């Protein structure tokens, strides 16, 4: 009666000693890739039927911090997919209230969306993925779901996934991650395919015209790209159930293996004054209307000041934002007296030799390396790694205003930190 | 007969699977760090009494190649100091034919020296060590020697290193990359500080006024700043005899050790038309020279070409730079065209489905990661690493110009070739 996971064997992998939080195992394991160095890697995407909010900027951008850390830092070969939702209930509501057309709707608000990834500097995926190019691919994986008795197709023509078959199996168990939360044949049973009334959108499938439902797309596209298995699957806390269970069991009865994603990382929720940021709450900021008041970097440093899979408050009117425009603060501060010295340095008039004030910055560049090395592999801690990062700049703008100048050891400097602030996101 | 090595002890240290040839070994052998994942670096330096020529550029090009290597791509903590030789014969004789006093000479052609490195792109080392700011640590170095019984004092007051006695000790061996190669006691003997000639710079010393002879100031220095062991020390394939073994003969009989270095590096010399580039032979070519007719980037990739330890063999009126050219258009090319291309790309009017082009582009691109990896593990093979982002651009370009683009594959192809180009020095 309990879900079990297995983790990856480390012969022929990478191994750095990095612990993730794993919905999974509900736990802190050690990473450990399927092949090599070699992580695949899949993100739910947005709905594109509105603009994005602080609440999407959260998810994004701290599994772009992430990202950073595993490419730019530990040098892993990440391979990221992630779908847009342009088929959907919202959407086809919308676009009937506007009466403009569901395709010209979708395509708006996609634009807006990497516009705004773009503005807070978010990289691009290796793959974009858009439901509408995958309908026939969805009904090729839902037709073999049928074909392994885990799914079954209403009169209406709708097709619903069989939990109870699935959990018959012993191979197989359905809501791994939140295993509590749980005329078709059960309640809890979901849709596959969606019977599409004559007024809807609807695609031609073996069981009559019909959407792709709400959990399927996902699998489709996932599997396809990244194949049997995924290192890494990422999103909201929210998605956790019913979202990401579905796709898990959706996968899982495709391929008819036990394990789709070896690692599932959920973003915690962002909250505006102790409720989540939601457009029915009508308490969402757009991301649009938070640049007009902050800064790509600031907004960034909000994000890494509250640890990714924690959880979050949001006080608006700048509240939360004051320590952030601080740290943005010093930050450039630094970076221009830093940038100034190794410009104008003259090594004629300069002495080199190697003194106590010297090694003793040193020690403490070196000291603050393996500091952040440990915060990153203790499950991405940010806040800490940035607070390591403070801590050296005020040595450094010690030396730099009173010390004699080692040229090399500024310069060496400046590399590292623009290294990890390249990992941040950050750019100055 | 034959000296032993000791390699490092892997518990607690970074390993990755690296291999150097190593002038103590003779061959090429694991690198393993002394302590966790740090590497303490001296390099000689260049004695300041004229310009530098291609010869001296392809040492410290190639070496900064190395350190770029160990420090960006498998992110070791490098800390790398370089003498500068602002005391020598050569500086005195000069000086007095100048007739601008020996400090300003000196400082002139170190300011030139560094122009020039900037010129290479050449990063500076962490600390920067003149021998000037060093003589009085020299003194004391060369009292402790001679308090291991190690050295003796002449009547004419220099001190001159007692071969007989070091090599007597089993722990010591004198001439140990070497070991064929090989008044006072012993023709062998060499001059720790020599007595001062009338009419030379000179500094007190309890045996008499003096210079400090030519190999023991960078035992001094290097000791002082980076200790009793040293993970790495590099330099000119000629100064493995006398220069480089006489430091480890100095640095042993100071601590009264065994290993003083762990790795030592040496670059191949250049030959042009099939002889070594020296001032002596009049067959030199400056790097300011060299500069009016060719780039930073074309020089850099002209000692990409060939492997840092190898021979490689420059034939003017640019019969080698040729091929550099060639290679430095092609850079230029891909990325203008890349670019271009990810600007134009529009999101709504593409069709963003992961075609067949698309996945065997991501297959060759995440191949070439893994194959220059194997490269840099196989003693910094540059030569082939090169050839490989030469390859991978070539068929970029071809499916940039056909195939339909995602743009998120090209922006991570784009960047993995940005860490590659500045692994190399190159800045386009
Ligand atoms: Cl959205
Ligand atoms: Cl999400
Ligand atoms: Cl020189
Ligand atoms: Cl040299
Ligand atoms: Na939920
Ligand atoms: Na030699
Ligand atoms: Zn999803
Ligand atoms: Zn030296």
Chains 1, 2 share one sequence.
């Not at 993730?20 to 695949?40: A, D, M, R, W, Y």
């Not at 078709?184 to 019909?210: I, Q, R, T, V």
């Not at 934002?321 to 501060?333: G, L, P």
């Amino acid at each position: 009666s309990l879900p079990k996971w297995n983790q990856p064997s480390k012969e022929g992998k990478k191994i750095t000693n990095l612990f993730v939080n794993n919905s999974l195992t509900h736990s802190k394991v050690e990473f450990i890739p399927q092949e090599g160095n070699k992580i695949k890697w899949y993100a739910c995407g947005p709905t594109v039927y509105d603009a994005a909010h602080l609440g999407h900027a959260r998810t994004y951008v701290s599994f772009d911090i992430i990202r950073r850390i595993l490419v730019n830092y530990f040098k892993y070969d990440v391979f990221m997919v992630i779908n847009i939702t342009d088929i959907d209930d919202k959407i086809i509501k919308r676009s009937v209230e506007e009466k403009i057309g569901f395709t010209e709707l979708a395509r708006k608000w996609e634009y807006e969306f990497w516009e705004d990834m773009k503005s807070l500097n978010v990289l691009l995926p290796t793959a974009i993925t858009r439901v509408s190019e995958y309908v026939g691919d969805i009904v090729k994986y839902i037709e073999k779901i049928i074909e392994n008795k885990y799914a079954y197709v209403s009169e209406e023509g709708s097709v619903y996934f069989d939990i109870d078959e699935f959990k018959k199996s012993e191979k197989h168990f359905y809501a791994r991650m939140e295993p509590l939360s749980v005329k078709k044949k059960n309640a809890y049973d979901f849709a596959l395919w969606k019977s599409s009334k004559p007024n809807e959108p609807h695609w031609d499938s073996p069981w009559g015209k019909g959407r792709p439902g709400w959990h399927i797309e996902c699998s489709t596209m996932a599997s396809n790209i990244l194949g049997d298995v995924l290192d890494i699957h990422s999103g909201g806390i929210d998605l956790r159930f019913p979202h990401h269970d579905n796709e898990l069991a959706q996968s899982e009865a495709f391929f008819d293996h036990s394990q789709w994603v070896n690692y599932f990382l959920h973003s915690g929720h962002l909250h505006i004054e102790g409720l989540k940021m939601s457009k029915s709450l009508k308490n969402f900021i757009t991301i649009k209307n938070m640049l007009t008041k902050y800064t790509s970097n600031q907004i960034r440093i909000l994000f890494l000041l509250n640890k990714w899979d924690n959880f979050m408050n949001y006080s608006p009117n700048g509240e939360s934002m004051v320590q952030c425009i601080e740290i943005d603060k010093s930050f450039t501060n630094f970076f221009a007296i830093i940038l100034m010295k190794i410009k104008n340095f003259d090594l004629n008039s300069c002495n080199l030799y190697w003194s106590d004030a010297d090694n003793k910055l040193n020690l403490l560049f070196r000291q603050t390396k393996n500091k952040i090395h440990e915060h990153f592999l203790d499950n991405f801690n940010t806040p800490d790694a940035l607070l390591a990062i403070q801590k050296l700049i005020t040595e450094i703008n010690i030396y730099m205003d009173k010390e004699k100048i080692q040229i090399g050891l500024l310069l060496e400097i400046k590399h590292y930190i623009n290294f990890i602030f390249d990992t941040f996101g950050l750019i100055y």
